[PDB]
């Protein structure tokens with residue numbers, strides 16, 4: 014009923030949308046992994062009379078449900094999607110998207126890692142993002158590569174019209190007590206990568222983590238703090 018929806022409020026296989034700003038929504042879904050259930054976020058950005066999707070809803074059937082929820086709530090076609098790293102909460106569902114006519118994109122790094130992992134592979138490579146600090150425009154967003162953090166390939170996404178920073182899995186929610194799933198992380202570089210984000214987007218008003226509740230700029234420092242305390 015209007016609060017941001019949490020893991021125990023969303024059955025696996027349903028998707029919720031949350032209005033962040035004019036023309037900006039998050040999507041929230043839940044999935045089982047290794048015997049536990051987790052929420053995850055993505056982004057939807059209005060692109061004239063079309064929509065840009067950032068990240069899948071973590072699985073094929075969740076992503077089909079995402080498309081249906083978009084049609085219900087927004088009613089504009091999703092024409093392009095960007096996946097912000099290679100894990101299944103970001104690319105699982107790309108095959109569903111592709112067969113719905115969505116053009117799917119990711120950095121070459123992400124594409125390689127997805128293929129090596131046996132995950133679904135976005136079709137199109139996003140060049141111009143290979144060095145930390147790189148940025149490119151993609152429809153109504155800017156894509157930024159901050160350096161290795163949660164994963165070596167993680168991208169963040171900024172919506173300049175709304176000052177919305179979508180950190181993806183490089184950014185954790187304020188209630189977070191741990192650095193999440195660090196199996197592919199660089200704990201040593203993660204703070205430095207977060208500092209790059211902080212420097213590059215000082216006017217961000219809303220920060221959206223890859224999992225959990227949006228907030229303000231404090232999510233960035235909180236993330237650095239939790240990662241440093243984990244590494245220790």
Ligand SMILES: CC(C)c1cccc2c(-c3ccc(CNS(=O)(=O)C4CCNCC4)c(F)c3)c(C(=O)O)[nH]c12
Pocket residue numbers: 020046050051052100101102163182192193194195223224225
């Ligand atoms: C490899 C990919 C597909 C993957 C698989 C499985 C899990 C993860 C996570 C992940 C894991 C745990 C948390 C925090 N625990 S929690 O359950 O969400 C929270 C607990 C107390 N209150 C509310 C709920 C978290 F935020 C993220 C991440 C990530 O960190 O990017 N990636 C994952």
Ligand SMILES: [Zn+2]
Pocket residue numbers: 098100163164182
């Ligand atoms: Zn991940």
Ligand SMILES: [Zn+2]
Pocket residue numbers: 100102182223224
């Ligand atoms: Zn994640």
